């Protein structure tokens, strides 16, 4: 455990120290987990997260560098990133993010996301808060605390109600067979939010949220979404709203942008575009990798 120069960074299972290597004096992120406070010892969630990250080695996924056991502690050594997307979006809100940077970020997120789905891993809770960026113009998927890997959940929603602004509508409708498409939806809402500086589905809670989506994308039916009316939480008494002129929703978007967003936002999980598929979308025809100046 010594090759470090700790510094604070309210973390996850306790604190989260930013630190330096001793040999390499390199910035790293340390997640501290206690092994001697819980009835069953090492939390099953930590165990699942570790095995999950062990297989997720990709440039666009925060990398688990090492797992160190010391005393009554378990230290997860993650690669260190300076900040998250929420802070960034807020440090240029009026200024907006340049298209080349928005395109690059969405491009990387779809790469990390494609890698994830190729390993039977669903993130289930993608949002600005857990999409970290560094000073080399990279953005990475982080915090797989609500992930479903190999079909097994690291944690279920029932207790961890985060934010529902990026939750796919099939989850909201209690679909019992939801899968990888739910993450694509989250990215679709995040891709828009970047462009407009505003959250796509600014819903109040649980109930509103679903309607917030209906009042924007129109109440789905059996034509656009075969099987909706059979969803566990679908209600025949639902209000029949209609689509909104998307051209007015995400205005600064070019014919390709909405072309990609419209496919990441299909009500039908079967029609919704995949990560792999979106990678070959023309909107990514001219993708560079600009590197922003970070407000640190």
- The tokens for 138 are 């990279």
Active-site pick, 36, 66, 90, 125: 125
125 assigned to active site: yes
Q: Which residues pair with 217 in a beta bridge?
A: 243
Q: Taking the CB of residue 260, how many other CB atoms lie within 10 A of it?
A: 21
DSSP 261: H
- The tokens for 96 are 């907006």
Residue 257 sits at the vertex; the CA angle it makes with 289 and 226, to the nearest 5 degrees, is 125
Shortest spacing between CB 175 and another protein, in angstroms: 13
Tell me which of Cl ion, another protein, none is bound by residue 254, counting a contact when its beta carbon lies within the kind-specific cut-off of 5 to 8 angstroms: none
Which residues 207-246 are close enough to bind Cl ion by CB under 5 A?
A: 211, 239
Tell me which of Cl ion, another protein, none is bound by residue 239, counting a contact when its beta carbon lies within the kind-specific cut-off of 5 to 8 angstroms: Cl ion
Q: With respect to another protein, which residue has the nearer C-beta, 148 or 212?
A: 148
**Which H or E element spans position 246?**
helix 246-249
Nearby residues of 159 by Cβ (< 8 Å), 6 or more positions away: none
Query: How many Å apart are CA 229 and CA 236, to the nearest integer?
Result: 7
- Residues that bind Cl ion (rule: CB under 5 A) add up to a total of 2
Interacting residue with another protein among 117, 167, 272, 281 (CB under 8 A): 117
Is 269 in contact with 181 (CB distance < 8 Å)?
yes
State yes or no: 12 annotated in a binding site. Answer: yes
> Site map for another protein, 44-73, x if CB under 8 A?
x--xx-xx--xx-----------x-x----
Query: How many Å apart are CA 67 and CA 56, to the nearest integer?
Result: 15
* Main-chain dihedrals φ then ψ at residue 26, nearest 5 degrees: -95, 140
State yes or no: 267 annotated in a binding site. Answer: no
Q: With respect to Cl ion, which residue has the nearer C-beta, 151 or 239?
A: 239
Q: With respect to another protein, which residue has the nearer C-beta, 20 or 120?
A: 120
> Site map for another protein, 163-202, x if CB under 8 A?
----------------xx----------------------
Distance set, CA 240 to CA 61, 164, 216, 245 (Å) = 40, 22, 11, 16
Which residues form the catalytic set? Answer: 125
Binding site members: 10-16, 31, 79-81, 84, 127-130, 143
List interacting residues with another protein (CB under 8 A): 35, 39-42, 44, 47-48, 50-51, 54-55, 67, 69, 74, 117-122, 148, 150-152, 179-180, 274, 276
List interacting residues with Cl ion (CB under 5 A): 211, 239
């Amino acid at each position: 455990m010594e090759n470090f120069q700790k510094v604070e960074k309210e973390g996850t299972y306790g604190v989260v120290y930013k630190a330096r290597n001793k040999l390499t004096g390199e910035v790293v992120a340390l997640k501290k987990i206690r092994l001697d406070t819980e009835t069953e010892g090492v939390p099953s969630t930590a165990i699942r997260e570790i095995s999950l990250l062990k297989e997720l080695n990709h440039p666009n996924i925060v990398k688990l560098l090492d797992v160190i056991h010391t005393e009554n502690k378990l230290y997860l050594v993650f690669e260190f990133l300076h900040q998250d997307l929420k802070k960034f979006m807020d440090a240029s809100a009026l200024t907006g993010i340049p298209l080349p940077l928005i395109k690059s970020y969405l491009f990387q997120l779809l790469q990390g996301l494609a890698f994830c789905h190729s390993h039977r891993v669903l993130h289930r809770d993608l949002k600005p808060q857990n999409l970290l960026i560094n000073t080399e113009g990279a953005i990475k998927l982080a915090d797989f605390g609500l992930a479903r890997a190999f079909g097994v959940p690291v944690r279920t929603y029932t207790h961890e109600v985060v934010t529902l602004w990026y939750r796919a509508p099939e989850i909201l409708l209690g679909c019992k067979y939801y899968s990888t498409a739910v993450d694509i939806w989250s990215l679709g809402c995040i891709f828009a939010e970047m462009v407009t500086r505003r959250a796509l589905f600014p819903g109040d809670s649980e109930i509103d949220q679903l309607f917030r989506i209906f009042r924007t994308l129109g109440t789905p039916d059996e034509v656009v979404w075969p099987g909706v009316t059979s969803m566990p939480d679908y209600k025949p008494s639902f209000p029949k709203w209609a689509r909104q002129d998307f051209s007015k929703v995400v205005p600064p978007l070019d014919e390709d942008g909405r072309s990609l967003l419209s496919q990441m936002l299909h009500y039908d999980p079967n029609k919704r575009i995949s990560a792999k598929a979106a990678l070959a979308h023309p909107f990514f025809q001219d993708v560079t990798k600009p590197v922003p100046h970070l407000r640190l």
